[PDB]
Amino acid sequence: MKLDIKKTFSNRSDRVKGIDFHPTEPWVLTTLYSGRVELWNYETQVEVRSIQVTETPVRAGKFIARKNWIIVGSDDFRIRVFNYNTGEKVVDFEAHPDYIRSIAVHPTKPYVLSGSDDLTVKLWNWENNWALEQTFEGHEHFVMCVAFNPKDPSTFASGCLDRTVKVWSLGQSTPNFTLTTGQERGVNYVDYYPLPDKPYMITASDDLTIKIWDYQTKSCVATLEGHMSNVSFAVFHPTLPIIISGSEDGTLKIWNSSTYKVEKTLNVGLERSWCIATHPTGRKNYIASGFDNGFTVLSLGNDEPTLSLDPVGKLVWSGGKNAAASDIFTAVIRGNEEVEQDEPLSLQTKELGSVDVFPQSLAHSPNGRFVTVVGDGEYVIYTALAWRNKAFGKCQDFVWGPDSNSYALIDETGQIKYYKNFKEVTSWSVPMHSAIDRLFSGALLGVKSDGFVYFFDWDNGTLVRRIDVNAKDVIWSDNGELVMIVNTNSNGDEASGYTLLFNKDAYLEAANNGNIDDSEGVDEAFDVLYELSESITSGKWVGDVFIFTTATNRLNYFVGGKTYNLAHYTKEMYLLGYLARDNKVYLADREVHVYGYEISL
Amino acid sequence: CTFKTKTN
């Protein structure tokens, strides 16, 4: 992967010991060495509420959102709850005759965990008036960190400086098992891997190392040593295949959970790294951290490769090696470039602009006027000339209409919306009752449900036809007569695609008649001209000719039932377009290096 | 030093 980190919100503050994300509200909570607690809207960069709780460091703070509470533990032996809507001290008691290090909140049950230097862990029931239900003994030193198994909240790990982790079920005075860590300086932190495909855990030590454990088989999977000083935390991101550690060396290390190699190192500049949080449900992939000098909120995306070519020859992409995933760049193509075959074109990168989301993909309007970037549930539309904004919104799919001034979406509820003039047509409705896999552009809006393909008239929305083919892609000719229906071949039983001719007349007649069969459409509007052999990875029409890439990486052309190979490349090659000026077709590889191939009989 | 002190 190529991770990308955006610095959402940073606050210089006293030593930040505890830190937690609210799950619905864009709020980070922080517990300080100063006995003060803070609530920040990291998204509008505003301090909501802040309480002077104690003179003593408060080390553990967590959200119980469901009861609209914050819960915090200090060095005065105490546990205190507050309502954050009101700032009103709900509860305040003595929970251990020693420091309180760590707190865990039960996902569902009114159950709250606290770990202590008193050697013990303890269970607390709030809707039975905070009575101490069970006291877990066994550890022979400071209990640094408690953690519920997200997959089985009846059980929980506890990381201890006595060099062990101890998993217990709610009820037994004894542990199910006890994990000697080998980490001769002790465990500061423990975290569960959230996904059901691995029973992994993780620890972090003063001994500079991080350790991944299998808790079924009870064995050390891997040692991950980076850090130059004591490792403070190590956690699994809820959503990206990463581990995140932090430490007194001042750094944050983002590790890869598969290769166990450090993907990314950050020196936030707040000195020593104390504590960690990840937005519960991956929102913006937020992770937040606490330091000697304060806290930061970081969003983590990916620099996925994007490129759209325009008809007149302009390339536009996001990201890159020397650059950021959400920076936009543009480059012009001219027959200029000496026709050397398999070397990437050299062009001059001009800065074009920026965008607020992590692209997964990017695409010009048909006429090359506008650019749409799609990502992270959001779509955005920019002017290609001075990178001016023209539209934003949420979408699971975006497809451009012929006009180059209208489009269609699958929205946050999975329902097709149609915009005309950047300003939605409310009345335009296509009632789709199955689930919508996808959306295609071209001269009829294409909609994939089941192993089917529906074709609707752009202006009204009436089903022009339904094709019973499990399409991968749908690629139209520019003059609107031809279409190629690429087939998700799925074990080469069927042909890889089908040419179809579209009679618009046959549609319009069945339109006047009111004889459009709302299940199928119009049998006469679509005729199957040919079937295709080899698999199709991408493809452009150039008149009656279909230029296409294969999974053998070969470049072919199809014209009137015949497949002629034209070149045989040796990478993953994708088609970008056909410039007539340079009589040239243009290709892109996995690294966005652009190639040019020349075409004549 | 013989004793570090996890008082932070």
Author numbering:
A (entry chain A): 1 to 601
B (entry chain P): 1 to 8
Question: What does the published report state?
Answer:
COPI mediates retrograde trafficking from the Golgi to the endoplasmic reticulum (ER) and within the Golgi stack, sorting transmembrane proteins bearing C-terminal KKxx or KxKxx motifs. The heptameric COPI complex (α/β/β'/γ/δ/ε/ζ) is recruited en bloc onto Golgi membranes (Hara-Kuge et al., 1994) but can be divided conceptually into two subcomplexes. The α/β'/ε B-subcomplex has been likened to clathrin because α-COP, β'-COP, and clathrin contain N-terminal WD-repeat (also referred to as β-propeller) domains and C-terminal α-solenoid domains and because recent studies have suggested that β'-COP, like clathrin, can form trimers. We demonstrate that N-terminal WD-repeat domains of α- and β'-COP directly bind dilysine motifs and establish the molecular bases for the interactions using X-ray crystallography, structure-directed mutagenesis, and isothermal titration calorimetry (ITC).
In contrast, we do not observe trimer formation of the N-terminal WD-repeat domain in any of our structures of either β'1-304 with different peptides (Supplemental Experimental Procedures) or β'1-604 with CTFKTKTN. One explanation for the poor fit is the significant conformational flexibility within β'-COP as indicated by comparing our structure of β'1-604 with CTFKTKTN with the unliganded structure. Flexibility in the COPI coat is in line with cryo-EM reconstructions and cryoelectron tomography data (Faini et al., 2012). It may be that once the N-terminal WD-repeat domains are anchored to the membrane by cargo binding, flexibility between the two WD-repeat domains of β'-COP, and likely also α-COP, may facilitate assembly of polymeric coats having a range of geometries with local but no global point group symmetry. Flexibility between β'-COP WD-repeat domains and the location of cargo binding have implications for COPI coat assembly.
